[PDB]
Design an enzyme around this catalytic site. Structure first.
Site, PDB file in Angstrom:
ATOM      1  NE  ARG A  41      -6.939  -5.005  15.563  1.00  0.00           N
ATOM      2  CZ  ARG A  41      -6.393  -3.813  15.302  1.00  0.00           C
ATOM      3  NH1 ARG A  41      -6.501  -3.259  14.092  1.00  0.00           N
ATOM      4  NH2 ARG A  41      -5.720  -3.180  16.253  1.00  0.00           N
ATOM      5  N   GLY A  42      -9.339  -5.250  11.190  1.00  0.00           N
ATOM      6  CA  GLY A  42     -10.074  -4.026  11.260  1.00  0.00           C
ATOM      7  C   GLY A  42     -11.517  -4.392  11.574  1.00  0.00           C
ATOM      8  CE  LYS A  43     -14.500   0.570  11.488  1.00  0.00           C
ATOM      9  NZ  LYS A  43     -13.871   1.942  11.545  1.00  0.00           N
ATOM     10  CB  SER A  45     -11.275  -7.761   6.755  1.00  0.00           C
ATOM     11  OG  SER A  45     -10.384  -6.652   6.719  1.00  0.00           O
ATOM     12  CE  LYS A  62     -10.071  -6.000   3.396  1.00  0.00           C
ATOM     13  NZ  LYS A  62     -10.612  -4.877   2.501  1.00  0.00           N
ATOM     14  CG  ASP A 150     -10.537   4.902   5.377  1.00  0.00           C
ATOM     15  OD1 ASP A 150     -10.601   5.874   6.242  1.00  0.00           O
ATOM     16  OD2 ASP A 150     -10.450   3.680   5.681  1.00  0.00           O
TER      17      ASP A 150
END
Ligand SMILES: Ic1c(I)c(I)c2[nH]cnc2c1I
Length: 327
Positions: A41-43, A45, A62, A150
């Site tokens: 997970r991330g900010k 997705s 995703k 990134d």
């Protein structure tokens, strides 16, 4: 500032190539793919391993959290432009929940091992090998007019058994346009380059080389993350404490950047700490004079003085990797 290479890729291509706001998504069929289990997970997705129901292949799914039209067409366009390049993640399909319209991106499945468990077992040769693989992808996307913006361990997937690697998560990536001014709130804090920390907005490809150098320093010195600041002002201090402040002052004046009163006060005055001051018992099997020469050529305040991805793949640090390949 303009890029020393690939500066004109998007200038010579048809506008449809880089004008991502003109994309119209061909939506696939949501039911071809079922989620099996959560893996990340991330900010922006959630990420699941899944199955393609037609052929019974694995995939990765995703699911994106609510995003601006513009932002999401940039990601997809860049992903399509780069599908098929060396070690670039393959987008397979784009689909949406009919009721809520939530988009999902479907990818090839990579069978990964977490960096925090994998890296401390990597040999000296393995380290050389995977950085090289990662450099292939970098040169590829720069050669096609894109900065990733990134780079970091969390975004490089590795199947240690098949010795394969993919660069993932193109959410923050942009087309490079000569003279264009850019948002500096990109990359993750430990991997942000001085240009971002001081607000030079006309950066290029070379930003991804600083981040790589950060990832590299961390791998050879067994120090995750290598530059450990708590916020953006602290990040620059933590760099100035290693690289020394003399280099900083020449940088600033070269590009005529006024630093901020308070930041300038935080940074202070510091001399250069030699790379070898970080060697210890746990790490000297990985630190050699070729590793250090290579590292030194990545981590420069001046973005115009860092190695290109194409020049780095040829430094003698990678000689044995190159010779395994030619055979
Ligand atoms: I674990 C994993 C794998 I494997 C892939 I492919 C991803 N792509 C985006 N995030 C990903 C995560 I977290």
């Amino acid at each position: 500032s303009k890029a020393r290479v690939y500066a004109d890729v998007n200038v010579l291509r048809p506008k449809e190539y880089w004008d991502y706001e003109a994309l119209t998504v061909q939506w696939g069929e949501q039911d071809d793919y079922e989620v099996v289990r959560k893996v990340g997970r991330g900010k922006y997705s959630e990420v699941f391993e899944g199955i393609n129901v037609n052929n019974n292949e694995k995939c990765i799914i995703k699911i994106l959290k609510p995003v601006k039209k513009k932002k999401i067409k940039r990601e997809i366009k860049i992903l399509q432009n780069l599908c098929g390049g060396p070690n670039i993640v393959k987008l397979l399909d784009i689909v949406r929940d009919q009721h809520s319209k939530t988009p999902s991106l479907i990818f090839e499945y990579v069978n990964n091992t977490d960096f925090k468990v994998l890296y401390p077992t990597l040999t000296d040769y393995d380290i050389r090998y995977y950085i090289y693989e990662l450099l292939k992808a970098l040169d590829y996307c720069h050669s096609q007019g894109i900065m990733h913006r990134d780079v970091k361990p969390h975004n490089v997937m590795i199947d240690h058994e098949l010795r394969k690697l993919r660069l993932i998560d193109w959410g923050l990536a942009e087309f490079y346009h000569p003279g264009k001014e850019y948002n500096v709130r990109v990359a993750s804090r430990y991997f942000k380059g001085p240009e971002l920390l001081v607000d030079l907005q006309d950066y290029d490809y070379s930003l991804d080389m600083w981040s790589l150098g950060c990832m590299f320093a961390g791998m050879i010195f067994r120090k995750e993350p290598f530059f450990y600041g708590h916020d953006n002002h602290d990040q620059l201090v933590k760099i100035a404490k290693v690289l020394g402040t003399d280099g900083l002052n020449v940088y600033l004046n070269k590009y005529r950047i006024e630093l901020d009163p308070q930041l300038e006060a935080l940074v202070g005055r510091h001399s250069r700490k030699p790379w070898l001051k970080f060697m210890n018992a746990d790490n000297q099997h990985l630190v050699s004079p070729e590793a250090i020469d290579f590292l030194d050529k990545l981590l420069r305040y001046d973005h115009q003085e860092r190695l290109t991805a194409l020049e780095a793949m040829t430094h003698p640090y990678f000689q044995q990797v190159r010779a395994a390949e030619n055979s």
